[PDB]
Structure 1
Amino acid sequence: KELEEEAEEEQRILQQSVVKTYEDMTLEELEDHEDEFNEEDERAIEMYRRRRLAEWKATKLKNKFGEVLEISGKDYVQEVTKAGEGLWVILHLYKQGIPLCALINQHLSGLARKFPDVKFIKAISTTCIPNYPDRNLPTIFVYLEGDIKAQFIGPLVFGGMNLTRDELEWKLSESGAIMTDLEENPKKP
Protein backbone atom coordinates (compact mmCIF):
# COMPACT_ATOMS: atom_id res chain seq x y z
CA LYS A 1 0.00 0.00 0.00
CA GLU A 2 2.04 2.92 1.35
CA LEU A 3 5.39 1.10 1.47
CA GLU A 4 6.55 3.49 -1.25
CA GLU A 5 9.24 6.16 -1.07
CA GLU A 6 9.44 9.77 -2.25
CA ALA A 7 10.49 8.80 -5.78
CA GLU A 8 7.79 6.13 -5.99
CA GLU A 9 5.17 8.56 -4.69
CA GLU A 10 6.20 11.12 -7.31
CA GLN A 11 6.03 8.44 -10.01
CA ARG A 12 2.55 7.43 -8.86
CA ILE A 13 1.21 10.99 -8.72
CA LEU A 14 2.64 11.70 -12.18
CA GLN A 15 1.19 8.49 -13.62
CA GLN A 16 -2.30 8.83 -12.09
CA SER A 17 -3.44 11.82 -14.14
CA VAL A 18 -0.78 14.58 -13.99
CA VAL A 19 -0.32 16.07 -10.51
CA LYS A 20 -2.39 17.42 -7.62
CA THR A 21 -0.77 20.87 -8.28
CA TYR A 22 -1.45 21.98 -4.67
CA GLU A 23 -4.79 23.59 -5.58
CA ASP A 24 -7.54 20.93 -5.69
CA MET A 25 -8.02 19.38 -2.24
CA THR A 26 -10.78 19.40 0.38
CA LEU A 27 -10.56 20.16 4.10
CA GLU A 28 -9.05 16.70 4.67
CA GLU A 29 -5.81 16.18 2.74
CA LEU A 30 -4.66 19.78 2.42
CA GLU A 31 -5.06 19.80 6.20
CA ASP A 32 -3.21 16.51 6.69
CA HIS A 33 -0.27 17.06 4.32
CA GLU A 34 0.25 20.47 5.92
CA ASP A 35 4.03 20.42 5.38
CA GLU A 36 4.80 19.87 1.68
CA PHE A 37 3.38 23.33 0.99
CA ASN A 38 6.19 25.85 0.73
CA GLU A 39 6.12 28.79 3.13
CA GLU A 40 6.62 31.74 0.77
CA ASP A 41 2.91 31.75 -0.17
CA GLU A 42 1.20 31.41 3.21
CA ARG A 43 -1.22 34.23 2.39
CA ALA A 44 -2.44 32.53 -0.79
CA ILE A 45 -3.00 29.14 0.85
CA GLU A 46 -4.72 30.79 3.82
CA MET A 47 -7.03 32.79 1.55
CA TYR A 48 -7.84 29.56 -0.29
CA ARG A 49 -8.52 27.90 3.07
CA ARG A 50 -10.89 30.67 4.15
CA ARG A 51 -12.78 30.59 0.85
CA ARG A 52 -13.10 26.79 0.99
CA LEU A 53 -14.31 27.04 4.60
CA ALA A 54 -16.94 29.54 3.46
CA GLU A 55 -17.96 27.14 0.69
CA TRP A 56 -18.18 24.23 3.15
CA LYS A 57 -20.33 26.18 5.61
CA ALA A 58 -22.58 27.38 2.78
CA THR A 59 -23.01 23.80 1.55
CA LYS A 60 -23.74 22.50 5.05
CA LEU A 61 -26.27 25.31 5.51
CA LYS A 62 -28.32 24.07 2.54
CA ASN A 63 -27.84 20.36 3.38
CA LYS A 64 -30.86 19.85 5.63
CA PHE A 65 -32.97 17.02 4.15
CA GLY A 66 -31.05 13.78 4.70
CA GLU A 67 -33.80 11.25 4.00
CA VAL A 68 -36.78 10.82 1.70
CA LEU A 69 -40.16 12.04 2.96
CA GLU A 70 -43.24 10.36 1.51
CA ILE A 71 -46.40 12.35 0.75
CA SER A 72 -49.94 11.88 -0.54
CA GLY A 73 -51.91 13.83 -3.14
CA LYS A 74 -52.95 16.47 -0.61
CA ASP A 75 -49.58 18.20 -0.19
CA TYR A 76 -48.25 16.91 -3.53
CA VAL A 77 -48.87 20.31 -5.13
CA GLN A 78 -46.73 22.05 -2.51
CA GLU A 79 -43.84 19.60 -2.69
CA VAL A 80 -43.96 19.52 -6.50
CA THR A 81 -44.19 23.28 -7.03
CA LYS A 82 -43.51 25.16 -3.77
CA ALA A 83 -40.52 23.00 -2.80
CA GLY A 84 -38.34 26.13 -2.79
CA GLU A 85 -36.20 28.37 -4.96
CA GLY A 86 -33.15 26.65 -6.40
CA LEU A 87 -34.30 23.18 -5.32
CA TRP A 88 -35.44 20.24 -7.43
CA VAL A 89 -37.26 17.09 -6.37
CA ILE A 90 -37.32 13.41 -7.33
CA LEU A 91 -41.00 12.36 -7.09
CA HIS A 92 -40.68 8.58 -7.20
CA LEU A 93 -44.18 7.27 -7.94
CA TYR A 94 -44.20 3.71 -6.63
CA LYS A 95 -46.52 0.84 -5.78
CA GLN A 96 -46.13 -2.45 -3.90
CA GLY A 97 -44.94 -4.18 -7.06
CA ILE A 98 -41.95 -6.12 -5.77
CA PRO A 99 -38.98 -5.74 -8.12
CA LEU A 100 -38.49 -2.18 -9.31
CA CYS A 101 -40.28 -0.31 -6.54
CA ALA A 102 -38.39 -2.39 -3.97
CA LEU A 103 -34.96 -1.85 -5.52
CA ILE A 104 -35.50 1.87 -6.13
CA ASN A 105 -36.94 2.34 -2.64
CA GLN A 106 -33.88 0.75 -1.05
CA HIS A 107 -31.53 2.77 -3.27
CA LEU A 108 -33.21 6.18 -2.83
CA SER A 109 -32.75 6.02 0.95
CA GLY A 110 -29.01 5.59 0.46
CA LEU A 111 -28.89 8.30 -2.19
CA ALA A 112 -30.76 10.74 0.07
CA ARG A 113 -28.43 9.86 2.94
CA LYS A 114 -25.37 10.50 0.76
CA PHE A 115 -27.08 13.49 -0.92
CA PRO A 116 -28.67 15.56 1.88
CA ASP A 117 -28.67 18.44 -0.63
CA VAL A 118 -31.59 17.48 -2.90
CA LYS A 119 -35.20 16.73 -1.97
CA PHE A 120 -36.32 13.10 -2.19
CA ILE A 121 -40.07 12.46 -2.16
CA LYS A 122 -41.94 9.24 -2.93
CA ALA A 123 -45.68 8.84 -3.45
CA ILE A 124 -48.02 5.96 -4.20
CA SER A 125 -49.52 6.06 -7.69
CA THR A 126 -53.11 5.37 -6.62
CA THR A 127 -53.56 8.47 -4.43
CA CYS A 128 -51.13 10.86 -6.17
CA ILE A 129 -52.35 10.75 -9.79
CA PRO A 130 -56.02 10.01 -10.61
CA ASN A 131 -56.18 6.47 -12.04
CA TYR A 132 -52.56 6.08 -13.05
CA PRO A 133 -52.04 3.36 -15.71
CA ASP A 134 -49.79 1.41 -13.28
CA ARG A 135 -48.19 -0.61 -16.10
CA ASN A 136 -45.18 1.74 -16.13
CA LEU A 137 -44.29 0.63 -12.62
CA PRO A 138 -41.27 2.93 -11.99
CA THR A 139 -41.95 6.65 -12.28
CA ILE A 140 -39.37 9.26 -11.23
CA PHE A 141 -40.69 12.51 -12.71
CA VAL A 142 -38.01 15.02 -11.72
CA TYR A 143 -39.22 18.61 -11.31
CA LEU A 144 -36.62 21.36 -11.59
CA GLU A 145 -38.79 24.07 -10.04
CA GLY A 146 -42.33 23.15 -11.11
CA ASP A 147 -41.73 22.06 -14.70
CA ILE A 148 -40.38 18.96 -16.42
CA LYS A 149 -36.68 18.24 -15.97
CA ALA A 150 -36.50 14.49 -16.65
CA GLN A 151 -38.66 11.38 -16.78
CA PHE A 152 -38.16 7.64 -16.25
CA ILE A 153 -41.30 5.55 -16.72
CA GLY A 154 -40.28 2.17 -18.12
CA PRO A 155 -38.32 -0.60 -16.43
CA LEU A 156 -36.52 -0.86 -19.77
CA VAL A 157 -35.33 2.73 -19.28
CA PHE A 158 -33.59 1.72 -16.05
CA GLY A 159 -32.65 -1.67 -17.50
CA GLY A 160 -34.77 -4.05 -15.42
CA MET A 161 -33.58 -5.92 -12.35
CA ASN A 162 -29.92 -5.30 -13.19
CA LEU A 163 -29.73 -2.10 -11.13
CA THR A 164 -26.69 -1.43 -8.96
CA ARG A 165 -26.38 0.99 -6.05
CA ASP A 166 -24.90 4.11 -7.65
CA GLU A 167 -25.76 4.14 -11.36
CA LEU A 168 -29.07 5.69 -10.31
CA GLU A 169 -26.94 8.67 -9.27
CA TRP A 170 -25.75 9.13 -12.86
CA LYS A 171 -29.23 8.46 -14.24
CA LEU A 172 -30.70 11.29 -12.16
CA SER A 173 -27.71 13.61 -12.59
CA GLU A 174 -27.58 13.45 -16.40
CA SER A 175 -30.60 15.78 -16.51
CA GLY A 176 -28.70 18.52 -14.65
CA ALA A 177 -28.88 17.44 -11.01
CA ILE A 178 -26.11 17.79 -8.43
CA MET A 179 -22.69 16.68 -9.68
CA THR A 180 -21.33 13.15 -9.32
CA ASP A 181 -18.23 11.79 -7.62
CA LEU A 182 -18.29 8.90 -10.11
CA GLU A 183 -17.13 8.47 -13.70
CA GLU A 184 -18.22 6.38 -16.71
CA ASN A 185 -21.62 6.68 -18.37
CA PRO A 186 -23.35 3.32 -17.61
CA LYS A 187 -21.26 2.61 -14.48
CA LYS A 188 -19.08 0.16 -16.42
CA PRO A 189 -21.54 -2.63 -17.24
Structure 2
Amino acid sequence: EWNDILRKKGILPPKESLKELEEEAEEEQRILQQSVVKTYEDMTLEELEDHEDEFNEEDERAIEMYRRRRLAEWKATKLKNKFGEVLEISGKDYVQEVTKAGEGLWVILHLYKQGIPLCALINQHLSGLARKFPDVKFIKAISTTCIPNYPDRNLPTIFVYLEGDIKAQFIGPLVFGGMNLTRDELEWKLSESGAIMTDLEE
Protein backbone atom coordinates (compact mmCIF):
# COMPACT_ATOMS: atom_id res chain seq x y z
CA GLU A 1 0.00 0.00 0.00
CA TRP A 2 1.91 2.99 1.34
CA ASN A 3 5.19 1.60 0.02
CA ASP A 4 3.84 1.34 -3.53
CA ILE A 5 2.35 4.83 -3.30
CA LEU A 6 5.87 5.91 -2.35
CA ARG A 7 7.02 4.01 -5.42
CA LYS A 8 4.73 5.96 -7.72
CA LYS A 9 5.85 9.22 -6.11
CA GLY A 10 9.36 8.63 -4.75
CA ILE A 11 12.26 6.17 -4.83
CA LEU A 12 13.28 6.59 -1.18
CA PRO A 13 12.97 2.84 -0.44
CA PRO A 14 14.40 0.39 -2.98
CA LYS A 15 12.43 -2.88 -3.26
CA GLU A 16 11.52 -3.18 -6.98
CA SER A 17 14.92 -3.85 -8.52
CA LEU A 18 17.16 -6.71 -9.65
CA LYS A 19 14.20 -8.80 -10.85
CA GLU A 20 15.56 -8.56 -14.41
CA LEU A 21 18.91 -10.29 -13.77
CA GLU A 22 17.60 -13.82 -13.23
CA GLU A 23 15.06 -13.18 -15.99
CA GLU A 24 17.80 -12.47 -18.54
CA ALA A 25 19.91 -15.34 -17.20
CA GLU A 26 17.06 -17.81 -17.69
CA GLU A 27 16.39 -16.35 -21.15
CA GLU A 28 19.99 -17.02 -22.15
CA GLN A 29 19.87 -20.47 -20.53
CA ARG A 30 16.91 -21.43 -22.72
CA ILE A 31 18.53 -19.75 -25.75
CA LEU A 32 21.82 -21.66 -25.49
CA GLN A 33 19.99 -25.00 -25.77
CA GLN A 34 19.80 -24.92 -29.60
CA SER A 35 23.58 -24.97 -30.12
CA VAL A 36 23.56 -28.76 -29.68
CA VAL A 37 21.36 -29.23 -32.78
CA LYS A 38 22.58 -26.19 -34.74
CA THR A 39 25.93 -27.84 -35.55
CA TYR A 40 24.91 -31.52 -35.39
CA GLU A 41 25.55 -31.84 -39.12
CA ASP A 42 28.36 -29.25 -38.92
CA MET A 43 30.86 -31.02 -36.63
CA THR A 44 31.26 -34.75 -37.30
CA LEU A 45 33.28 -35.70 -40.39
CA GLU A 46 32.21 -39.36 -40.22
CA GLU A 47 28.49 -38.78 -40.86
CA LEU A 48 28.90 -40.18 -44.37
CA GLU A 49 30.21 -43.33 -42.72
CA ASP A 50 27.17 -42.93 -40.43
CA HIS A 51 24.62 -43.83 -43.10
CA GLU A 52 21.25 -45.31 -42.08
CA ASP A 53 21.26 -43.42 -38.78
CA GLU A 54 22.02 -39.88 -40.03
CA PHE A 55 20.17 -39.59 -43.36
CA ASN A 56 16.66 -38.22 -43.82
CA GLU A 57 17.17 -36.20 -47.00
CA GLU A 58 20.16 -35.05 -49.05
CA ASP A 59 19.94 -31.66 -50.76
CA GLU A 60 23.37 -32.36 -52.35
CA ARG A 61 24.09 -28.61 -52.45
CA ALA A 62 25.21 -27.57 -48.97
CA ILE A 63 26.05 -31.16 -48.02
CA GLU A 64 28.41 -31.81 -50.91
CA MET A 65 29.67 -28.33 -50.04
CA TYR A 66 30.27 -29.70 -46.55
CA ARG A 67 32.28 -32.57 -48.02
CA ARG A 68 34.28 -30.03 -50.03
CA ARG A 69 35.13 -27.86 -47.02
CA ARG A 70 35.80 -30.98 -44.93
CA LEU A 71 38.24 -32.41 -47.47
CA ALA A 72 40.01 -29.06 -47.78
CA GLU A 73 40.32 -28.97 -43.99
CA TRP A 74 41.60 -32.56 -43.91
CA LYS A 75 44.23 -32.00 -46.59
CA ALA A 76 45.36 -28.79 -44.90
CA THR A 77 45.75 -30.49 -41.51
CA LYS A 78 47.40 -33.68 -42.78
CA LEU A 79 49.88 -31.84 -45.01
CA LYS A 80 51.56 -30.59 -41.80
CA ASN A 81 52.18 -33.93 -40.03
CA LYS A 82 55.96 -34.02 -40.51
CA PHE A 83 57.38 -34.44 -36.99
CA GLY A 84 57.30 -36.88 -34.10
CA GLU A 85 60.91 -37.42 -33.04
CA VAL A 86 62.74 -34.96 -30.81
CA LEU A 87 66.05 -34.18 -32.49
CA GLU A 88 69.59 -33.30 -31.34
CA ILE A 89 71.02 -30.42 -33.34
CA SER A 90 74.40 -28.98 -32.37
CA GLY A 91 75.32 -25.63 -30.86
CA LYS A 92 77.35 -24.59 -33.92
CA ASP A 93 74.16 -24.17 -35.97
CA TYR A 94 72.23 -22.76 -33.00
CA VAL A 95 71.94 -19.23 -34.40
CA GLN A 96 70.33 -20.67 -37.53
CA GLU A 97 67.33 -22.19 -35.71
CA VAL A 98 66.86 -19.65 -32.94
CA THR A 99 66.06 -17.27 -35.82
CA LYS A 100 65.63 -19.20 -39.10
CA ALA A 101 62.99 -21.59 -37.78
CA GLY A 102 59.95 -20.60 -39.83
CA GLU A 103 57.32 -17.96 -39.05
CA GLY A 104 53.98 -19.29 -37.87
CA LEU A 105 55.50 -22.48 -36.42
CA TRP A 106 55.88 -22.86 -32.67
CA VAL A 107 59.27 -24.04 -31.42
CA ILE A 108 59.56 -25.87 -28.10
CA LEU A 109 63.23 -25.17 -27.43
CA HIS A 110 64.16 -27.72 -24.77
CA LEU A 111 67.53 -27.47 -23.01
CA TYR A 112 68.79 -30.12 -20.61
CA LYS A 113 71.64 -32.02 -19.00
CA GLN A 114 70.96 -35.75 -19.06
CA GLY A 115 71.27 -37.79 -15.88
CA ILE A 116 68.68 -36.52 -13.39
CA PRO A 117 65.26 -38.29 -13.41
CA LEU A 118 63.78 -34.80 -13.67
CA CYS A 119 65.34 -34.12 -17.07
CA ALA A 120 64.96 -37.75 -18.15
CA LEU A 121 61.24 -37.81 -17.38
CA ILE A 122 60.74 -34.43 -19.05
CA ASN A 123 62.55 -35.70 -22.15
CA GLN A 124 60.33 -38.80 -22.08
CA HIS A 125 57.18 -36.68 -21.84
CA LEU A 126 58.18 -34.38 -24.71
CA SER A 127 59.25 -37.30 -26.91
CA GLY A 128 55.89 -38.93 -26.29
CA LEU A 129 54.19 -35.62 -27.04
CA ALA A 130 55.97 -35.63 -30.40
CA ARG A 131 53.97 -38.78 -31.21
CA LYS A 132 50.76 -36.76 -30.79
CA PHE A 133 51.59 -33.34 -32.27
CA PRO A 134 53.81 -33.75 -35.35
CA ASP A 135 53.12 -30.10 -36.16
CA VAL A 136 55.44 -28.78 -33.42
CA LYS A 137 59.20 -28.32 -33.73
CA PHE A 138 60.96 -30.01 -30.80
CA ILE A 139 64.60 -29.25 -30.03
CA LYS A 140 66.80 -31.07 -27.50
CA ALA A 141 70.53 -30.67 -26.89
CA ILE A 142 73.14 -30.16 -24.19
CA SER A 143 72.95 -26.59 -22.90
CA THR A 144 76.72 -26.52 -22.38
CA THR A 145 77.32 -26.56 -26.13
CA CYS A 146 74.31 -24.28 -26.63
CA ILE A 147 75.23 -21.75 -23.92
CA PRO A 148 78.86 -21.74 -22.71
CA ASN A 149 79.31 -22.94 -19.12
CA TYR A 150 75.58 -22.67 -18.51
CA PRO A 151 74.65 -23.06 -14.82
CA ASP A 152 73.83 -26.74 -14.34
CA ARG A 153 71.47 -25.80 -11.47
CA ASN A 154 69.06 -24.24 -14.00
CA LEU A 155 67.86 -27.34 -15.85
CA PRO A 156 65.65 -28.49 -17.35
CA THR A 157 64.58 -25.06 -18.62
CA ILE A 158 61.76 -25.01 -21.16
CA PHE A 159 61.95 -22.36 -23.86
CA VAL A 160 59.06 -21.30 -26.08
CA TYR A 161 60.21 -19.31 -29.11
CA LEU A 162 58.75 -18.01 -32.35
CA GLU A 163 60.30 -15.33 -34.58
CA GLY A 164 62.99 -14.83 -31.95
CA ASP A 165 60.43 -13.66 -29.36
CA ILE A 166 60.10 -15.53 -26.07
CA LYS A 167 56.41 -16.19 -25.56
CA ALA A 168 56.44 -18.66 -22.67
CA GLN A 169 59.06 -19.50 -20.06
CA PHE A 170 59.44 -22.43 -17.68
CA ILE A 171 62.81 -22.07 -16.00
CA GLY A 172 64.42 -24.92 -14.09
CA PRO A 173 62.59 -27.66 -12.21
CA LEU A 174 61.01 -24.98 -10.00
CA VAL A 175 57.91 -25.38 -12.18
CA PHE A 176 58.38 -29.07 -13.07
CA GLY A 177 59.74 -30.48 -9.80
CA GLY A 178 58.47 -33.93 -8.90
CA MET A 179 58.38 -37.40 -10.43
CA ASN A 180 54.59 -37.22 -10.04
CA LEU A 181 54.55 -34.84 -13.03
CA THR A 182 52.82 -36.48 -15.96
CA ARG A 183 51.98 -36.52 -19.67
CA ASP A 184 48.78 -34.49 -19.55
CA GLU A 185 50.19 -31.80 -17.26
CA LEU A 186 53.02 -31.10 -19.70
CA GLU A 187 50.51 -30.98 -22.54
CA TRP A 188 48.43 -28.60 -20.40
CA LYS A 189 51.38 -26.27 -19.87
CA LEU A 190 52.27 -26.19 -23.57
CA SER A 191 48.61 -25.52 -24.36
CA GLU A 192 48.72 -22.65 -21.86
CA SER A 193 51.66 -21.35 -23.88
CA GLY A 194 49.07 -20.74 -26.61
CA ALA A 195 50.37 -23.39 -29.02
CA ILE A 196 47.83 -26.19 -28.44
CA MET A 197 44.07 -26.25 -27.83
CA THR A 198 42.97 -29.22 -25.69
CA ASP A 199 41.11 -29.87 -22.44
CA LEU A 200 42.32 -31.18 -19.08
CA GLU A 201 40.86 -31.46 -15.59
CA GLU A 202 43.75 -29.69 -13.85
Task: Please give the TM-score of this superposition, normalised by the length of structure 1.
Answer: 0.79
Aligned counterparts of 2:49 and 2:30: Cα–Cα separation in 1: 21
Kept in 2: contact 1:91–1:123 (CA 8 A): no
Deviations 1:121-164 (A, max 9, x none): 11111111111111122111110221101111131312422211
Deviation at 1:50, TM superposition (A): 1.3
Shift in CA distance, 34/171, structure 1 to aligned 2, threshold 3 Å: farther
Deviation at 1:2, TM superposition (A): 44
Shift in CA distance, 43/17, structure 1 to aligned 2, threshold 3 Å: closer
Deviations 1:59-108 (A, max 9, x none): 11122122211112112222221111211211110112321111011111
CA-atom RMSD in angstroms: 7.3
Residue of structure 2 in register with 1:136 after alignment: 154
Q: Which moved more, 1:4-13 or 1:16-25?
A: 4-13
Aligned counterparts of 1:114 and 1:8: Cα–Cα separation in 2: 41
Partner SS for 1:140: strand
Shift in CA distance, 151/50, structure 1 to aligned 2, threshold 3 Å: same
Aligned counterparts of 1:37 and 1:91: Cα–Cα separation in 2: 48
Partner SS for 2:120: helix
Aligned counterparts of 2:194 and 2:177: Cα–Cα separation in 1: 21
Kept in 2: contact 1:13–1:19 (CA 8 A): no
Deviation at 1:38, TM superposition (A): 2.7
Q: Which moved more, 1:10-19 or 1:31-40?
A: 10-19
Deviations 1:155-187 (A, max 9, x none): 131242221112111101112102225454xxx
Is the radius of gyration larger for structure 1 or structure 2? 2
Partner SS for 2:140: strand
Q: Which moved more, 1:14-23 or 1:83-92?
A: 14-23
Kept in 1: contact 2:109–2:160 (CA 8 A): yes
Deviation at 1:21, TM superposition (A): 4.0
Deviation at 1:42, TM superposition (A): 3.3
Q: Which moved more, 1:41-50 or 1:55-64?
A: 41-50
Deviation at 1:15, TM superposition (A): 11
Aligned counterparts of 2:151 and 2:177: Cα–Cα separation in 1: 20
Shift in CA distance, 107/8, structure 1 to aligned 2, threshold 3 Å: farther
Shift in CA distance, 7/157, structure 1 to aligned 2, threshold 3 Å: closer
Aligned counterparts of 1:8 and 1:28: Cα–Cα separation in 2: 35
Kept in 2: contact 1:91–1:121 (CA 8 A): yes
**In the alignment, structure 1 residue 25 sits paired with structure 2 residue 58:** no
Partner SS for 2:104: coil
Aligned pair count reads 184
Shift in CA distance, 6/132, structure 1 to aligned 2, threshold 3 Å: closer
Question: Identity rate of aligned residues, in percent?
Answer: 100
Deviation at 1:34, TM superposition (A): 6.0
Considering fraction of residues, name the structure with more strand.
2
